Design a binder for these strands. Structure first.
Ligand SMILES: [Zn+2]
Ligand SMILES: [Zn+2]
Lengths: 99, 65, 138, 46, 50, 58, 76, 116, 103, 115
RNA sequence: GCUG
């Protein structure tokens, strides 16, 4: 394995002697089986913006979180309340006022 | 209505780039060169900024305020 | 981004294969808005339609499930999610055909799937009719 | 059970009791919109 | 996330959970992961001139 | 819409459903995929007998 | 005996349909069914073993009739 | 909905699946004149044991592979099952052992799961 | 209950067996197929997804002679694990070396 | 040629695997081996065909429908020749003798020759 | 009026 180039957020490397089936698995695992943390439930109080709450919830889920996944654990089915180990809580409160 | 947060196909975050792209266009930068400065090399990402219509500003003119 | 190719055999006759990750990111995401409107009229006799408040459960100090989303004026409140067989406007009308006697005629959300209320519009016509329009979102 | 409605043009909160014509003080508008629910609402981000 | 006008407020609480990309694309950790085989152009005959 | 054609020659029937159709080549040619939402509604009266008593209990 | 030896498709459909209704109504099953919970599947198994207790009466147009046992008729 | 011949209504064995549409193998598109462009089809559940047998024996797809008219087959291969078969059976195709097995192993599903 | 082994026939001949692997997709099956098709004893190895909806892969191994087919399948899983262990170590060493030259 | 269920020669077209007409392998199996055997084959092909095409790839592009140089020259020559011949026929009807085809008026004849 |  030779690292042609590494910069923050980009890695280019060459694997020589590996097969396509093993190599495709690594690409498929990276895209679908490596875990990360993302917003699942948005509790909404006083949303008065033009953006619809369902659209706003979807946008928040897409935004990436810098928390390291290995530290946290998978939440059990249901168990909505959650625990310190299984969840992270973020609060957004913004009110627009004339200058 | 508002710039999509992530490119639909590739999944790159393109939400951050909208404000910069508008500013680059305000300066002499060409649309292709502006997209190049933002770093949107792949065609899938470029179309999202190039084809986006910003209706949030127009819709807000009719919002309650 | 269209690849013109033959993939998976689920695309034999005009059918098209979509990407799951594109749909998750927002490709083809759409909103359906539906109406619901109610009119409260003043009759020739000096009697009127009325909206009663939510019928509480005396045992638990909460409204009954069919009335769960009603505000204190008997009209559903923006932001809350309606479900099937739930009332939106707790309308009652006189059965005049000595004091008034009222039969319940509630406007109810029939629909297989859950809808959210975006706004409730209250206005009146010159004949003292009260008009209510609900905007519903899916 | 106090009820407050917001007018379409003036955007001023107006208290209208039952059997009261839907007119808003500070303007002549006859269209009034009910305020958003105080109750917490849960949306799945999915 | 959103654009607001005077008098408009967004108040909300978000819960973040561990997930895999198979369930939803929001959990995917890579903008794109791809592999290309190395090109090996060979000139069969010596090429000279214009 | 008359009784002879509307109500006698052709008539509306119950235990019936309708949906959009889409392809599935992994089914056999004698099979059709029915969605769960239709299957929970469209019921068949199974008469209880010695061969199915323990099946219908579940 | 003038009528065709082969069982017609219409005859097979009715014999299976009546037998299945009889089995669904708790009739004795002569096939020692193994793991079958559906009357139509049980009825088809009985026809393969040629053990169905039904006689087909074929009525000629004039009004004369000939009775053929389900076992006697050839099944295609 | 529009029926021009008897093969426009046939009996099928149900299998329950999660997604909302009705689904069938595209070899049966030619009898129904269906084209998967937002087409709708009707379903009827016979409520009687005698109505099951008449549906299964007389109206089953395996009993109706040929049209009554000229006696020609209507349930057969269609686009991408004719083109894939044509390109497979051309003389230029050669497979090694690894790709021969991986094409053949696709058939090993359903009732063919037990065969050598 | 991830792995259910279904023998080809009532006779339970060991040489042909179909392994049904639950919660699996092409990623494990295609990689395993390559590892278990590099075994000389396996005459035929293929994976099939029963339906796109159900996450199960049916892997059929037919052995050349009397081998039970569990032995080829197990050896293939062991080989894939060893290939992964080597790649991880080689990749980590190369990444560390690159950072050191950069420094 | 399909001898003992082995394809000895020939590719499979619509006329052999499709719905058009007889000589279709499915029809031959139907009568020879019964309805069930015929149905099984149709199911098996449906599984096998998509997998080959999906992994070989079939696509259509503007290159496929793009006219090559040979046609581009030929068309010019054919069109010019055809246009000239038509003009001559037009000239005859306008001023002269166009052999009137059996049973038709001259105008009708001109249409036929031109077509 | 439009879809089928
Ligand atoms: Zn992109
Ligand atoms: Zn006002």
């Amino acid at each position: 394995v030779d690292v042609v180039h590494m910069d923050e957020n980009s890695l280019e490397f060459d694997m020589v002697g590996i097969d396509a089936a093993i190599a495709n698995a690594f690409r498929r695992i990276l895209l679908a089986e490596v875990p990360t943390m993302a917003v699942e439930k948005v509790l909404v109080y006083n949303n008065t913006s033009i953006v619809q709450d369902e659209i706003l919830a979807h946008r928040l889920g897409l935004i990436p979180i810098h928390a390291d996944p290995r530290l946290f654990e998978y939440r059990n089915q249901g168990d909505e309340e959650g625990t310190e180990i299984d969840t992270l809580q973020f609060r957004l409160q913004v009110r627009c006022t004339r200058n | 209505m508002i710039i999509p947060v992530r490119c639909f196909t590739c999944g790159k975050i393109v939400g951050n780039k909208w404000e910069a792209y508008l500013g680059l266009l305000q300066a002499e930068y060409t649309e292709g060169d502006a997209l190049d400065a933002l770093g949107l090399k792949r065609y899938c990402c470029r179309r999202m900024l190039l084809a986006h219509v910003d209706l949030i500003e127009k819709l807000l003119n009719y919002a309650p305020l | 981004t269209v690849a013109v190719m033959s993939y998976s055999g689920y695309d034999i006759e005009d059918a098209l294969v979509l990407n799951k990750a594109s749909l998750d990111r927002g490709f083809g995401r759409c909103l359906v808005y539906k109406n619901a409107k109610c009119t409260l009229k003043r009759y020739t006799n000096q009697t009127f339609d009325k909206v009663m408040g939510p019928m509480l459960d005396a045992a638990t100090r909460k409204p009954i499930w069919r009335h769960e989303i009603l505000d204190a004026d008997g009209i559903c409140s923006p932001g809350e999610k309606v479900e099937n067989k739930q009332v939106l406007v707790n309308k009652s009308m006189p059965t005049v055909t000595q004091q008034p006697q009222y039969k319940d005629v509630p406007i109810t959300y029939k629909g297989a799937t859950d809808s959210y209320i975006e706004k409730v519009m209250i206005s009146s016509n010159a004949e003292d009719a009260f008009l209510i329009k609900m905007l519903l979102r899916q | 059970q106090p009820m407050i409605y917001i007018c379409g043009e003036c955007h001023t909160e107006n208290e209208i009791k039952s059997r009261d014509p839907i007119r808003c003080r500070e303007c002549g508008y006859r269209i009034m919109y009910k305020k958003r629910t105080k109750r917490l609402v849960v949306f799945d981000a999915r | 996330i959103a654009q607001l006008r005077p008098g408009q407020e967004i108040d909300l609480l978000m819960h973040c959970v561990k997930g895999i990309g198979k369930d939803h694309a929001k959990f995917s950790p890579v903008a794109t992961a791809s592999y290309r085989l190395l090109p090996d152009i060979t000139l069969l005959e010596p090429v000279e001139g214009e | 819409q008359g009784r002879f054609r509307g109500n006698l020659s052709g008539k509306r029937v119950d235990f019936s459903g309708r949906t959009v159709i889409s392809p599935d080549p992994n089914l056999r040619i004698d099979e059709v995929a029915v969605p769960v939402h239709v299957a929970k509604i469209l019921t068949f009266p199974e008469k209880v007998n010695k061969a199915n008593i323990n099946f219908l209990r579940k | 005996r003038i009528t065709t030896p082969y069982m017609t498709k219409y005859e097979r459909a009715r014999v299976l349909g009546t037998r299945a209704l009889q089995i669904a109504m708790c009739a004795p099953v002569m096939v020692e069914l193994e793991g079958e919970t559906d009357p139509l599947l049980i009825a088809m198994k009985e026809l393969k073993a040629r053990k169905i207790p039904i006689i087909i009466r074929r009525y000629l147009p004039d009004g004369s009739y000939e009775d053929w046992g389900v076992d006697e008729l050839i099944i295609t | 909905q529009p029926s021009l011949h008897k093969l426009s209504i046939m009996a099928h064995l149900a299998r329950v699946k999660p997604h909302r549409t009705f689904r069938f193998n595209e070899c049966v598109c030619t009898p129904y004149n269906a084209d998967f462009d937002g087409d709708e089809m009707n379903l009827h559940l016979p409520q009687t044991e005698e109505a099951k047998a008449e549906a299964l024996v007389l109206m089953g797809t395996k009993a109706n592979l040929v049209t009554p008219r000229n006696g020609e087959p209507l349930i057969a291969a269609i686009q991408d099952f004719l083109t894939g078969a044509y390109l497979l059976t051309l003389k230029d195709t050669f497979f090694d052992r690894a790709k021969a097995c991986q094409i053949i192993a696709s058939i090993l599903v359903g009732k063919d799961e037990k065969i050598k | 209950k991830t792995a259910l082994e279904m023998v080809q026939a009532a006779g339970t001949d060991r040489h042909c067996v179909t392994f049904v692997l639950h919660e699996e997709d092409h990623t494990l099956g295609n990689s395993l197929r390559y590892m278990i098709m590099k075994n000389p004893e396996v005459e035929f190895c293929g994976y099939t997804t029963t339906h796109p909806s159900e996450s199960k892969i049916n892997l059929r191994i037919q052995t050349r002679g009397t081998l039970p087919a569990v032995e080829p399948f197990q050896r293939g899983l062991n080989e894939l694990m060893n290939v992964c262990q080597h790649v991880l170590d080689k990749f980590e060493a190369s990444i560390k070396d690159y950072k050191d030259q950069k420094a | 040629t399909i001898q003992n269920s082995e394809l000895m020669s020939g590719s499979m077209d619509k006329g052999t695997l499709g719905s058009g007409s007889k000589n279709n392998i499915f029809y031959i199996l139907l009568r020879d081996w019964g309805q069930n055997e015929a149905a099984d084959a149709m199911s098996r092909l449906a599984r096998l065909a998509p997998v080959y095409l999906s992994n070989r790839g079939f696509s259509i592009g503007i290159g496929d429908v793009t006219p090559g140089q040979g046609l581009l020259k030929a068309k010019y020559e054919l069109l010019n020749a055809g246009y000239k011949k038509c003009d001559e026929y037009i000239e005859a009807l306008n001023t002269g003798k166009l052999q009137q085809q059996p049973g038709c008026t001259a105008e009708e004849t001109l249409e036929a020759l031109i077509l």
